A = this chain, B = another copy of it.
Amino acid sequence: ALCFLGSLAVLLCVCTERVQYYFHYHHVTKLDEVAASQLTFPAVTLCNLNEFRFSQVSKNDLYHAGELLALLNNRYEIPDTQMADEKQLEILQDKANFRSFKPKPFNMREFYDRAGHDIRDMLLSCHFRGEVCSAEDFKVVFTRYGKCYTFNSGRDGRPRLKTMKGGTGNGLEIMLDIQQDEYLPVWGETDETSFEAGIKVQIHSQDEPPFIDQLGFGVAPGFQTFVACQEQRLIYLPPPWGTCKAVTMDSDLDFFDSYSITACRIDCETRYLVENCNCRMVHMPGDAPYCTPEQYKECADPALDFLVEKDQEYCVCEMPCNLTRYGKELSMVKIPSKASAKYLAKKFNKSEQYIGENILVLDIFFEVLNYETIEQKKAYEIAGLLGDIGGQMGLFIGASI
């Protein structure tokens, strides 16, 4: 009959349509809602928006950094501009008196470490799953805001805390004093001053460095702020199926052991400033020298701004393959109640007015022992291609007998 010619014509033609499918390298995305007996609680990094406490700024610091913080002009004088408070201008005309004064050596990293807000003074109260925690439970981390702190860091081999139930009771609750009376006076616009009072916060996997100035959320004074979270786990496929970049212990990055958009970007930033400024900012990795006030103002602040705003050539940062995202729903209530104000004032030896202006509470917790997963899977595996081609080859071989 015609059947052996028309069985070879259809087999070899349909066989090359299951090979044109494979070589397109399709993927398919599986969504799931996994019920979880327990979840790993994330890292919570948090920063005061004020970088330098006024009371920690020495004559020597003012001498070196005063122009960078717009407290001095280029002539080491307190400016013509009377943005100053009367009582503040007295304290500062003193510090800014440089007659007979001999400069001592100065280091931006030291200054940040010494003058940065102290978690020990800021942290009025802290609880996790009902257990008390202290300033010892927060590891120091440097960010563009300066001396910041990470709760449940996972760093120093201490074990990562876990959430076993839904609701606020199985989460973090911290009361802070943002210390507005230590806020450095703002007499000019710079990258180191802000118009704002409160803290920046980032909730992130322990495996990701914080990127708090770009990806953080804000928490205001005078409110208890509830943050209800949801763990989202995302898997992506490498080339040729997608564009992602393996998360392993061989990062392939100058300054990081594991790949992450954040690590990739901090790497790229650090490289760029070292190349163009011959220094790194106090928060960047490597062993390059720390920038001086002059270098911050003249080279580094502008360069870093140029980089994260304009330049699109220098920073090529691809998706990681493993990635953990946190959905957040914020809500707030006022603190303090008219009733509670006097108790809080007395409990902390502050004015009632001060409590209103400086106290906040932050509750971070999960809605439900559940994570969304969104995994990209290979559409048509190479194994399953030879398991069709094996069965295509087996019946045209059964047509010859």
CB within 8 Å of B: which residues of A?
A: 1, 3, 28-33, 35, 49-50, 81-85, 129-131, 164-170, 180-181, 183-188, 193-200, 211, 213-226, 228, 234, 236, 242-244, 261, 305-306, 308-310, 312, 315, 318-319, 327-340, 342-344, 346, 357, 361, 367-368, 370, 374, 376, 398, 401
What 3 A-B pairs have minimum CB-CB distances, sorted nearest first?
A167-B214, A130-B309, A198-B333
User: B166 contacts A83, CB within 8 Å?
Assistant: no
- 20 more contacts with CB within 8 A, not counting A186-B339, A217-B329, are A29-B33, A35-B244, A83-B343, A129-B309, A130-B310, A165-B315, A166-B261, A168-B214, A169-B213, A180-B339, A183-B338, A185-B339, A198-B333, A198-B334, A199-B333, A218-B333, A222-B334, A261-B368, A328-B329, A330-B331
User: B337 contacts A49, CB within 8 Å?
Assistant: yes
User: B196 contacts A333, CB within 8 Å?
Assistant: yes
User: B164 contacts A346, CB within 8 Å?
Assistant: no
Give every chain B residue within 8 A of A338 (Cβ-Cβ).
180-181, 183, 197, 357
User: B211 contacts A167, CB within 8 Å?
Assistant: yes
Give every chain B residue within 8 A of A228 (Cβ-Cβ).
215, 217
A83-B343, A194-B337 known; A308 and B187 CB under 8 Å? no
Give every chain B residue within 8 A of A334 (Cβ-Cβ).
196-198, 220-222
The winner among A166, A315, A344 for most chain B CB atoms within 10 A is A166
Give every chain B residue within 8 A of A31 (Cβ-Cβ).
29, 31, 374
**C-alpha spacing A310/B329, complex, angstroms:** 25
CB A329 to nearest CB in B, in angstroms, measures: 5
Give every chain B residue within 8 A of A243 (Cβ-Cβ).
35
**C-alpha spacing A330/B217, complex, angstroms:** 8
User: B168 contacts A213, CB within 8 Å?
Assistant: yes
Q: Can you list 15 A-B pairs with a CB-CB distance of less than 8 A?
A: A31-B374, A35-B244, A130-B310, A169-B214, A183-B338, A193-B340, A195-B224, A196-B333, A197-B333, A197-B334, A197-B336, A198-B334, A217-B329, A218-B332, A338-B357
